[PDB]
Amino acid sequence: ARVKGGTVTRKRRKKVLKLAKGYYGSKHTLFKSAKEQVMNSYYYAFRDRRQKKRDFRKLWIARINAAARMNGLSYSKLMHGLKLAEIDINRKMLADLAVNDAAAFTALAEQAKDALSK
Amino acid sequence: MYAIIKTGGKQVKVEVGQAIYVEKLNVEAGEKVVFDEVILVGGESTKVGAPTVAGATVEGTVEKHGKQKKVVTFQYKPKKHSHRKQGHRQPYTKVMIEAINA
Amino acid sequence: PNVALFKQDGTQNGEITLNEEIFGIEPNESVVYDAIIMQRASLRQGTHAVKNRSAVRGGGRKPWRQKGTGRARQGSIRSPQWRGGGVVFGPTPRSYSYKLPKKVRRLAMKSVLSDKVAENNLVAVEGLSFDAPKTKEFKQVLANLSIDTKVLVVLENGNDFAALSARNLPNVSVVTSDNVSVLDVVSANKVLATQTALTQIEEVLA
Amino acid sequence: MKLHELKPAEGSRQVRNRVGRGTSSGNGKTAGRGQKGQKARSGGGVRLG
RNA sequence: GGUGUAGUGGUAGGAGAGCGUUCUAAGGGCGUUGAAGGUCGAUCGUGAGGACGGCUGGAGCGCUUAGAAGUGAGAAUGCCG
RNA sequence: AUCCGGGAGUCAGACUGCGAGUGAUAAGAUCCGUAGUCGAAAGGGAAACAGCCCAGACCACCAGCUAAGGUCCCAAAAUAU
RNA sequence: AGUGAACCAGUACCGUGAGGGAAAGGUGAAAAGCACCCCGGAAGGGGAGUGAAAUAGAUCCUGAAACCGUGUGCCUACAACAAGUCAAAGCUCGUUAAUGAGUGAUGGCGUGCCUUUUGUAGAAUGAACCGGCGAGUUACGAUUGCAUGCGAGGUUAAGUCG
Numbered sequence: 155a156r157v158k159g160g161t162v163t164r165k166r167r168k169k170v171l172k173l174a175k176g177y178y179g180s181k182h183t184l185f186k187s188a189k190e191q192v193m194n195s196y197y198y199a200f201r202d203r204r205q206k207k208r209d210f211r212k213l214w215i216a217r218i219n220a221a222a223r224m225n226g227l228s229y230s231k232l233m234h235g236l237k238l239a240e241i242d243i244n245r246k247m248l249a250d251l252a253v254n255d256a257a258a259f260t261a262l263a264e265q266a267k268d269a270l271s272k
Numbered sequence: 273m274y275a276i277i278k279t280g281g282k283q284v285k286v287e288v289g290q291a292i293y294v295e296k297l298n299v300e301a302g303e304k305v306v307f308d309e310v311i312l313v314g315g316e317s318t319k320v321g322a323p324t325v326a327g328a329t330v331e332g333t334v335e336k337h338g339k340q341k342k343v344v345t346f347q348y349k350p351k352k353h354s355h356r357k358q359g360h361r362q363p364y365t366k367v368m369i370e371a372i373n374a
Numbered sequence: 375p376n377v378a379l380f381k382q383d384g385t386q387n388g389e390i391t392l393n394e395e396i397f398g399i400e401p402n403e404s405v406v407y408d409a410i411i412m413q414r415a416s417l418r419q420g421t422h423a424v425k426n427r428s429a430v431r432g433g434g435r436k437p438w439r440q441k442g443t444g445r446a447r448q449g450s451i452r453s454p455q456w457r458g459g460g461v462v463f464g465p466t467p468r469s470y471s472y473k474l475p476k477k478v479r480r481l482a483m484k485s486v487l488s489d490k491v492a493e494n495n496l497v498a499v500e501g502l503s504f505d506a507p508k509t510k511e512f513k514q515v516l517a518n519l520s521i522d523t524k525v526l527v528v529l530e531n532g533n534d535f536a537a538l539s540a541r542n543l544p545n546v547s548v549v550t551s552d553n554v555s556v557l558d559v560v561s562a563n564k565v566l567a568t569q570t571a572l573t574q575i576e577e578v579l580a
Numbered sequence: 581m582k583l584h585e586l587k588p589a590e591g592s593r594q595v596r597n598r599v600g601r602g603t604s605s606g607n608g609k610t611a612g613r614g615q616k617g618q619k620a621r622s623g624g625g626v627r628l629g
Numbered sequence: 630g631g632u633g634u635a636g637u638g639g640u641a642g643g644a645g646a647g648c649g650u651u652c653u654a655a656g657g658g659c660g661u662u663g664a665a666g667g668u669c670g671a672u673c674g675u676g677a678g679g680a681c682g683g684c685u686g687g688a689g690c691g692c693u694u695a696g697a698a699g700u701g702a703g704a705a706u707g708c709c710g
Numbered sequence: 711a712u713c714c715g716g717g718a719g720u721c722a723g724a725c726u727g728c729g730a731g732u733g734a735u736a737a738g739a740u741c742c743g744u745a746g747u748c749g750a751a752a753g754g755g756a757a758a759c760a761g762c763c764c765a766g767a768c769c770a771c772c773a774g775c776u777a778a779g780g781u782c783c784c785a786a787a788a789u790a791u
Numbered sequence: 792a793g794u795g796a797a798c799c800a801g802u803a804c805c806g807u808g809a810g811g812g813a814a815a816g817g818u819g820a821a822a823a824g825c826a827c828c829c830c831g832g833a834a835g836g837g838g839a840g841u842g843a844a845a846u847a848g849a850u851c852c853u854g855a856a857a858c859c860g861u862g863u864g865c866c867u868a869c870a871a872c873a874a875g876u877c878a879a880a881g882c883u884c885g886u887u888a889a890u891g892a893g894u895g896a897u898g899g900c901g902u903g904c905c906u907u908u909u910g911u912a913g914a915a916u917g918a919a920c921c922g923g924c925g926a927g928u929u930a931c932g933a934u935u936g937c938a939u940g941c942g943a944g945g946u947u948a949a950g951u952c953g
């Protein structure tokens with residue numbers, strides 16, 4: 155009882171080629187080229203889910219430094235001041251305030267300045 | 273009118289009339305929720321309280337339990353003839369906001 | 375175990391007490407699975423072959439040289455990887471049949487007839503007589519006893535008019551009482567056995 | 581027992597192992613034989629004793 | 630079923646449990662009011678993989694349970710086109 | 711941990727502390743002993759870097775604290791006392 | 792695939808010779824196989840007709856990929872690029888309806904796949920590309936684990952009827 159290899163390989167290969175839409179040239183049209191490229195993209199995406207969380211933290215931190223130097227402080231002294239006062243705002247909300255509500259950011263910077271005035 | 277709340281393991285910015293996505297809650301759709309911990313009540317004048325603002329809550333209604341889009345995590349070691357593949361979809365709940373503390 | 379008796383049309387002409395060692399003995403289910411599988415693998419005709427490297431009508435010469443030609447070393451026009459070459463490890467003529475020990479054969483026969491009885495699926499009848507072989511009268515008889523499923527008809531002996539009349543009906547199978555197998559009883563929904571044939575089966579299963 | 585509901589007894593039949601059918605099964609690419617040597621060849625090995 | 634606590638990199642290699650192909654049996658189904666195959670889609674599952682809809686196509690094919698295997702391809706300075 | 715049984719693979723190692731021989735107390739040299747990493751180990755530091763310093767990836771997050779190493783600009787944090 | 796050979800095959804073809812040796816199946820239910828006209832030397836094409844269907848027209852069932860073209864939504868002539876991945880304005884659409892789809896200036900990060908190696912991006916090895924084919928099988932013995940029937944016992948071989 156013989157088993158022809160009819161329509162299984164074409165389905166698997168067309169599933170692979172559909173993931174390669176938008177690539178350059180023979181990297182979206184030939185199966186071997188696309189196979190290798192798709193493997194590399196899997197590697198890159200796993201790597202970059204972890205690197206994302208670092209990039210936004212550096213972005214927030216630099217915006218907060220910029221805002222605080224306008225209120226007579228630097229980033230490190232203002233973070234210490236907020237900790238000595240028991241304030242628990244993220245660096246995300248801090249930067250969001252720094253860009254949207256400058257008066258709220260100044261209220262907070264004054265609390266920090268009074269905390270480390272002791 | 274602003275409030276900042278601790279939900280999940282993170283913090284969110286909140287407003288009356290707007291809807292928010294959040295980690296899964298253990299509350300069926302249509303029922304009411306109280307977010308106890310408020311970090312800051314902005315708006316016109318800010319209430320910058322040590323960890324939480326004393327006596328402010330935020331009220332809402334759960335609308336929908338869902339799933340995020342799918343993530344694929346695939347892993348291979350070049351030249352070592354081996355790989356392993358795994359999928360994952362993440363739960364969430366959607367909440368509408370009503371009556372920041374009054 | 376007592377079964378009711380019928381006539382070619384009628385009613386409850388009493389009952390018939392059958393053996394308890396044959397028709398009432400609590401079937402064993404893996405023994406029946408084994409019997410069915412052995413019998414089905416026993417009907418195969420394993421007549422299949424293919425040609426290996428040395429049977430294909432072909433070449434003993436080395437087709438090109440071993441080196442120099444900028445080629446790949448090849449040994450014959452008939453190698454497994456050449457188009458038109460011979461097959462590596464195909465089907466060969468084989469047997470497919472085996473035997474189970476004698477006590478489990480007998481245990482499976484007893485168990486399958488006893489299962490038929492434990493659900494009022496065996497139907498006993500005094501006699502099946504016919505002056506001519508007529509299919510139409512057999513169908514009337516079959517409806518006389520309200521039988522509407524696949525049925526095994528177990529007959530006695532040179533009751534040849536009945537077997538002729540019961541052929542050709544597409545729900546009906548006919549077997550004599552010296553030739554019942556395990557696969558005949560499992561496939562039918564009911565058994566229609568005559569009183570004579572029932573004692574004759576009790577005589578050989580003992 | 582009906583011919584459309586067969587079931588062997590538990591533990592009585594096992595499947596089979598097919599070597600040389602991909603990496604993730606556990607036995608692709610050299611099929612359990614290790615790297616090179618007399619024992620990696622077809623018909624390789626030394627006589628008993 | 631709850632709840633706690635602990636664990637979950639991996640080549641050679643051992644152990645477990647599954648996905649898909651073709652054919653046999655028994656059962657229950659579909660089809661010119663359009664089967665298989667082909668093409669497109671923004672769909673589902675932890676993986677192999679599974680559906681539903683459009684267009685093409687013109688006569689056969691699924692599903693359940695068990696069985697049997699010429700049962701899975703990217704590489705051999707492989708063979709044919 | 712020990713005892714009985716089924717199935718293996720390995721018998722080309724490399725560098726870095728430490729302590730010895732051969733060498734010229736030369737070699738990314740060679741041959742032994744003892745500990746680690748690599749082999750079979752991703753992530754941060756060392757410009758780039760198998761084997762050095764920190765640390766062992768089941769998965770999701772636009773949350774938090776630290777290690778080695780750092781804070782004038784490239785490039786996150788003191789133009790600190 | 793199955794005979795080397797489903798077809799005018801031990802043929803065409805190759806060799807002084809002995810000898811070696813292929814490729815090549817499918818319109819439609821029925822030839823109803825396109826009368827007549829127009830462009831053109833013809834080939835071929837466009838109407839008109841046959842037919843359920845001609846994009847079933849003889850290179851005739853279905854008609855995949857490589858490869859070659861035509862039309863368009865978005866980008867591109869100061870820029871060093873294993874070609875993607877993560878972040879993201881503008882433009883263009885509107886789906887198995889849901890945390891929608893295509894393209895994308897600009898910014899961070901990043902030396903293919905396989906084999907053999909102490910060790911590889913390797914200036915070590917293989918592959919032009921696409922499709923098909925292409926590798927732990929069976930017979931008879933020996934041993935262990937699991938499963939079933941009998942149990943101080945267990946079991947038949949050749950053969951005879953079927």
